[PDB]
């Protein structure tokens with residue numbers, strides 16, 4: 129990847145089988161983008177960044193889908209220090225739904241610092257809270273929890289307002 | 305009192321009529337606090353504009369006024385210049401206490417300044433906001449037809465972000481504290497608002513800093529980014545009123561003035577930054593060199609706390625005649641900005 | 656015991672005031688005419704902008720409280736040792 133003589137290159141790393149393995153070099157250069165190099169840039173926290181650069185380079189077709197995947201993977205790995213200093217420098221013009229998708233990934237999982245980070249970059253929650261998204265927030269409930277049993281009893285007759293009424297009564301209880 | 309804001313300011317259509325749009329404007333479904341608002345005509349007296357600001361709406365007196373110009377790079381600016389706008393300008397306006405006079409639209413400079421104001425308010429807890437003010441023509445406003453009802457102190461639910469159409473009407477940035485919408489009744493032209501901008505900044509540069517005045521005159525500096533031809537005509541209309549300027553290193557007319565201050569061929573210099581109109585703009589270069597002292601350079605010396613020192617060096621260089629009055633003005637401005645660390649290490653060295 | 660008894664008394668003191676507020680408004684000897692009034696009644700069967708000015712005032716004090724708490728946390732010696 130830094131660059132006949134290539135058959136001579138084959139004739140000292142295994143010392144054997146020149147032309148079949150030369151066809152393997154041909155198929156290596158058919159891909160050309162799923163191969164990365166670690167040797168030039170070495171470091172401790174450089175490794176996870178090189179993993180991200182390998183995933184960005186092998187993404188290919190769309191650019192905005194590549195930066196969307198890099199942001200949502202930084203949410204998935206629970207690392208704010210990558211996304212703050214490598215995704216919000218100012219090179220990428222972030223749109224709305226690019227931030228709303230990662231906000232849903234930061235609400236469904238328990239990452240509070242991404243919630244504060246993504247709200248601070250100019251997102252409007254009056255447009256964000258679709259009632260389908262609110263149903264998806266109350267969907268992500270552990271099966272051995274308390275509200276899993278309480279929301280099952282509220283579906284006997286989501287149904288959050290009935291749960292608040294059976295806890296707090298008529299008074300002292302919000303609507304929805 | 306609420307009708308008083310309509311009985312003072314009038315608007316022409318040129319058939320002149322008393323105005324009907326004073327606003328406690330807020331944004332729909334958004335966090336930002338109510339903002340002040342006024343629709344105004346052109347060629348009005350800036351004295352009642354200023355008395356509206358510091359008496360009726362309620363804003364303190366400026367210790368500095370820095371108006372930012374340019375608008376060459378449309379959607380995306382260089383991140384080096386985003387470092388300049390965020391960590392050079394807005395935190396200096398937070399510390400010294402200053403007004404930023406920028407176009408209140410979402411296009412060009414007002415978008416980038418609004419990014420810098422929002423990012424600085426997020427990543428800093430100083431318990432005080434950055435007063436940024438916006439001037440823009442009434443004809444380019446996206447939702448100018450909502451702001452009519454003259455009842456009083458009304459929060460008009462200004463629908464930003466809606467009906468995305470490009471090129472003709474522009475929405476209001478929510479990163480501004482007060483809006484001055486100057487009307488010519490044209491409804492679509494770009495704006496003859498440069499005269500009102502020069503008269504308002506000249507009137508601010510007349511007044512005095514402090515409690516009952518009794519201080520120095522408020523310094524007014526102009527910051528340029530790359531810009532166009534009409535920005536250089538805006539340079540000359542600025543520097544006839546004795547207002548200093550400051551130049552950045554990016555491209556455009558700003559770097560044109562940089563390289564022209566670093567040193568026929570000058571007409572060839574004119575024939576690639578706009579690629580047009582050689583001899584009229586060559587006469588503009590002639591008037592630039594008539595001033596020669598109200599122009600400073602930022603590119604050679606860059607730094608975080610270097611910015612406020614460069615503002616002081618621009619004010620010292622443009623002072624001119626007397627030396628002792630220049631150092632007196634530098635000391636009393638360091639008192640006015642409430643910064644001991646400048647005056648101790650730059651005014652009491654021993655020179 | 657004296658501290659927990661004073662906290663318990665201060666909490667119940669609202670319930671005692673509230674139950675003298677909702678009584679028949681006469682002395683016990685004369686309450687029979689108010690139970691007759693209640694028995695025949697049984698047999699027959701802040702503005703908006705003042706609220707907004709109130710809640711914006713509350714939000715101002717909430718923002719000052721959170722900023723002063725953050726500045727007191729940042730200037731502590733342990734956090735300054737972390738930044739050093």
Ligand SMILES: Nc1ncnc2c1ncn2[C@@H]1O[C@H](COP(=O)(O)OP(=O)(O)OP(=O)(O)O)[C@@H](O)[C@H]1O
Nearest residue numbers: 223224249250251410464465468475476477478479
């Ligand atoms: N009228 C406005 N004034 C100031 N800032 C705005 C305005 N509208 C959007 N923004 C900021 O710009 C960002 C979005 O940019 P832009 O307006 O180009 O796209 P968008 O409106 O999100 O697109 P969509 O129409 O899909 O919502 C948001 O994070 C928001 O904070």
